[PDB]
Amino acid sequence: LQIAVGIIRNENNEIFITRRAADAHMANKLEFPGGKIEMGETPEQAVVRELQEEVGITPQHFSLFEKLEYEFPDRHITLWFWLVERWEGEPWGKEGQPGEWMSLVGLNADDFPPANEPVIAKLKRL
Ligand SMILES: Nc1nc2c([nH]c(=O)n2[C@H]2C[C@H](O)[C@@H](COP(=O)(O)O)O2)c(=O)[nH]1
Ligand SMILES: [Mn+2]
Secondary structure (H helix, E strand, O other), rough: OEEEEEEEEEOOOOEEEEEEEOOOOOOEEEEEEEOOOOOOOOOHHHHHHHHHHHHHHEOOEEEEEEEEEEEEOOOEEEEEEEEEOEOOOOOOOOOOOOEEEEEOOOHHHHHHHHHHHHHHHHHHOO
């Protein structure tokens, strides 16, 4: 299971975070909008499509900030963390999910999935 997520951050060094549903894997956890990279699709396409679907924006000139693999108690997933600094549209809860800007400095890794630990840390430096 390959996963593409977008680390969306504005000029104010804030990132746009969303909270996962109470009945989803890693429920109630904070997260970077993202989803499964589908067949016949590239990870770059997957992140654009996913952000469009989840927060209504289209990533532009983004880079791969981090790529890693994590083993959850019942599944193994590869995460593709894209740093998105330019985009069209305004990020919002397009799928009716909680969404808001969060200072990079005040992020608490414990709030996100354990898989994001290194990314969250590395983030506090760029
Ligand atoms: N969207 C998203 N999923 C994440 C993050 N970290 C992380 O482990 N995941 C995991 C949780 C899910 O098992 C999977 C995403 O699949 P869904 O979007 O279908 O929930 O990847 C993250 O920052 N964003
Ligand atoms: Mn998702």
